[PDB]
Amino acid sequence: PNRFDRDRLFSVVSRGVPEELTGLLEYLRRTSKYLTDSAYTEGSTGKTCLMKAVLNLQDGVNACILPLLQIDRDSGNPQPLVNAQCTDEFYRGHSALHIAIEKRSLWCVKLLVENGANVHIRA
């Protein structure tokens, strides 16, 4: 349960169960890695864990966003994955805030904006 691959992270965040986020805290402190690294995001697009969380919300709410945000702010790279951006030619600038807004989910927008968020990022 300690070592989780990016597919494992995607599967955990897709279902929406927050209790399966355990073990990542020791995981990134072990190999000295961060959630912002390319080792846990899609190489082609750049979709991250938060993005995969936002692409599916059970009735406009997820309980797995808060643990991920708090673990990232505890042991993250100076950008808490909220201002980290994709490098795709088709989605150059497709921010997480944009995905939160596009799904008409105000609550996750509030969470992201109170957990630090650069609105003026290019898209």
Curated annotation (Swiss-Prot):
Free-text tissue specificity from the UniProt record: Abundantly expressed in spleen, placenta, skeleton muscle, lung and brain.
- ANK repeat positions in this chain? 2-44, 45-91, 92-123
Q: Which residues carry this modification: Phosphoserine?
A: 11
Q: Which family does it belong to?
A: Belongs to the transient receptor (TC 1.A.4) family. TrpV subfamily. TRPV2 sub-subfamily.
Q: What does this protein do?
A: Calcium-permeable, non-selective cation channel with an outward rectification. Seems to be regulated, at least in part, by IGF1, PDGF and neuropeptide head activator. May transduce physical stimuli in mast cells. Activated by temperatures higher than 52 degrees Celsius; is not activated by vanilloids and acidic pH.
Quaternary structure, per UniProt, is:
Homotetramer. Interacts with a cAMP-dependent protein kinase type II regulatory subunit (PRKAR2A or PRKAR2B) and ACBD3. Interacts with SLC50A1; the interaction probably occurs intracellularly and depends on TRPV2 N-glycosylation.
Name of the protein: Transient receptor potential cation channel subfamily V member 2
| Protein's organism | Mus musculus
Q: Which gene encodes it?
A: Trpv2
The stretch of the full-length protein covered here is 67 to 189 of 756
